[PDB]
Enzyme design. Structure first.
Site, PDB file in Angstrom:
ATOM      1  N   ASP A   1      53.383 -23.031  18.968  1.00  0.00           N
ATOM      2  CA  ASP A   1      54.600 -23.643  19.118  1.00  0.00           C
ATOM      3  C   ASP A   1      55.200 -23.971  17.828  1.00  0.00           C
ATOM      4  O   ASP A   1      54.678 -24.837  17.078  1.00  0.00           O
ATOM      5  CB  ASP A   1      54.117 -25.109  19.799  1.00  0.00           C
ATOM      6  CG  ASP A   1      55.413 -26.070  19.893  1.00  0.00           C
ATOM      7  OD1 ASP A   1      56.530 -25.362  19.694  1.00  0.00           O
ATOM      8  OD2 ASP A   1      55.264 -27.324  20.395  1.00  0.00           O
TER       9      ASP A   1
ATOM     10  N   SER B   1      73.057 -20.972  12.744  1.00  0.00           N
ATOM     11  CA  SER B   1      73.848 -19.729  13.453  1.00  0.00           C
ATOM     12  C   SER B   1      75.145 -19.713  13.085  1.00  0.00           C
ATOM     13  O   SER B   1      75.726 -20.811  12.795  1.00  0.00           O
ATOM     14  CB  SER B   1      73.684 -19.765  14.684  1.00  0.00           C
ATOM     15  OG  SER B   1      74.346 -18.714  15.378  1.00  0.00           O
TER      16      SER B   1
HETATM   17  C1  LIG Z   1      53.532 -30.066  30.150  1.00  0.00           C
HETATM   18  C2  LIG Z   1      54.286 -29.042  29.608  1.00  0.00           C
HETATM   19  N1  LIG Z   1      54.847 -28.104  30.722  1.00  0.00           N
HETATM   20  C3  LIG Z   1      55.304 -26.825  30.240  1.00  0.00           C
HETATM   21  C4  LIG Z   1      55.495 -25.918  31.457  1.00  0.00           C
HETATM   22  C5  LIG Z   1      55.840 -24.683  31.371  1.00  0.00           C
HETATM   23  F1  LIG Z   1      55.645 -24.251  30.061  1.00  0.00           F
HETATM   24  C6  LIG Z   1      55.425 -29.411  28.538  1.00  0.00           C
HETATM   25  C7  LIG Z   1      56.380 -30.479  28.805  1.00  0.00           C
HETATM   26  C8  LIG Z   1      57.493 -30.677  28.039  1.00  0.00           C
HETATM   27  C9  LIG Z   1      57.286 -29.964  26.609  1.00  0.00           C
HETATM   28  C10 LIG Z   1      56.529 -29.187  26.192  1.00  0.00           C
HETATM   29  N2  LIG Z   1      56.336 -28.655  25.023  1.00  0.00           N
HETATM   30  C11 LIG Z   1      55.390 -27.981  24.454  1.00  0.00           C
HETATM   31  C12 LIG Z   1      55.674 -27.457  23.297  1.00  0.00           C
HETATM   32  N3  LIG Z   1      57.085 -28.024  22.963  1.00  0.00           N
HETATM   33  C13 LIG Z   1      57.485 -28.267  24.243  1.00  0.00           C
HETATM   34  C14 LIG Z   1      55.191 -28.858  27.177  1.00  0.00           C
END
Ligand SMILES: C[C@@H](NCCCF)c1cccc(-n2ccnc2)c1
Ligand SMILES: C[C@H](NCCCF)c1cccc(-n2ccnc2)c1
Length: 330
Positions: free
Chosen positions: A35, A199
């Site tokens: 991430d 961008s």
């Molecule tokens: C719980 C999880 N779900 C992701 C499902 C598909 F991938 C989530 C929900 C909201 C945001 C994130 N997230 C993680 C890093 N950046 C943002 C992850």
């Protein structure tokens, strides 16, 4: 040193990508969501509330001969999608694709929100934004990349995400076989802790390019491309029957549509996102309303070049003294 690991979509929509990570001695391999929009390496663990674990692989620090409690340290994080997790902290040996860091902070979840529990394929996150965003208290911890940097042949990592296919994260080198043409580098602001860049504009389909500055972040941990409402409206106006749905929570379009491409500028260069990349399928199983891959950032407070955008490119995260981003076609 270098490392090279394959990253694999979790599902048929490329909702996220998982990369195997070795933690501890003997190794415990967990599949983490890399991430570039956060800075914590956190895992499902033997400490996670049992009712909150549903199919994930867990890290058990008591089985690692190199794990040490980081005494007094806790962590707690909230993501843009409303999901969250928190817990305590170990240091341990962490390896990605052959590249090893000793003494990496491994944040062990005691609690995770329902969304993390419900995603059986993601065993945790490995943050690759700047260490200034790391949530460990009272002593902020470094990312895996920041701990590896001095050892790497070059202070870089690269993201090469696949469309409905595996891709690659490389650390410490740029694979000149993995892209076409040249890499265009662009300035980064680290002021918000993100890989934040500007961008130079966009085009919709075969339309003329609009020169306009769009500040946003390169974020592998966000699925979609979030852009200003003007840009998003211009895109979806080219798709018959597309509309913004308050009930669904974004732009939807008829599943029978063929979508136009979307181009974004990187300096004088252009990255073309094929139309198929923007199709996120039925809003609910069996629906003929499909969810769009380009959505408004108006409700976020930042533009986000998520996976929809990044998987159209070979992306260089240059962690030199003055960080920069590079984009190439592929
Ligand atoms: C719980 C999880 N779900 C992701 C499902 C598909 F991938 C989530 C929900 C909201 C945001 C994130 N997230 C993680 C890093 N950046 C943002 C992850
Ligand atoms: C998982 C996916 N898009 C990527 C995650 C968002 F970053 C999707 C596919 C179908 C429908 C939705 N949807 C419905 C209401 N809000 C969203 C989301």
């Amino acid at each position: 040193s270098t490392g090279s690991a394959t990253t694999t979509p979790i599902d048929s929509l490329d909702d996220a990508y998982i990369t195997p990570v070795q933690i501890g001695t003997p190794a415990q391999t967990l599949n983490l969501d890399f991430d570039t929009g956060s800075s914590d390496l956190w895992v499902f663990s033997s400490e996670t509330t049992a009712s909150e674990v549903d199919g994930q692989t867990i890290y058990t620090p008591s089985k690692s001969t190199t794990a040490k409690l980081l005494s007094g340290a806790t962590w707690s994080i909230s993501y843009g999608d409303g999901s969250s997790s928190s817990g305590d902290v170990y240091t341990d040996t962490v390896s990605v694709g052959g590249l090893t860091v000793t003494g990496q902070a491994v944040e062990s979840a005691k609690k995770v929100s329902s969304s993390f529990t419900e995603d059986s394929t993601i065993d945790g996150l490995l943050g690759l934004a700047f260490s200034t965003l790391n949530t460990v208290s009272p002593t902020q911890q470094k990312t895996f990349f920041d701990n590896a940097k001095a050892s790497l042949d070059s202070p870089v990592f690269t993201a090469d995400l696949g469309y409905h296919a595996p891709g690659t994260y490389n650390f410490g080198f740029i694979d000149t076989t993995a892209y076409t043409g040249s890499i265009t580098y662009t300035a980064v602001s680290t002021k918000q802790g993100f890989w934040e860049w500007t961008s130079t504009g966009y085009a919709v389909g075969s339309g003329t390019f609009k020169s306009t500055s769009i500040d946003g972040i390169a974020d592998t941990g966000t699925t979609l491309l979030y852009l200003p409402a003007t840009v998003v409206s211009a895109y979806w106006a080219q798709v018959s029957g597309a509309k913004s749905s308050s009930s669904v929570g974004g732009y939807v379009f008829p599943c029978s549509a063929t979508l136009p491409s979307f181009t974004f500028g990187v300096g004088s260069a252009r990255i073309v996102i094929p139309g198929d990349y923007i199709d996120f399928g039925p809003i609910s199983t069996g629906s003929s309303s499909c969810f769009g891959g380009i959505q408004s950032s108006a409700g976020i407070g930042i533009n986000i070049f998520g996976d929809v955008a990044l998987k159209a490119a070979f992306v260089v995260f240059n962690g030199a003294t003055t960080p920069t981003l590079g984009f190439a076609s592929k």
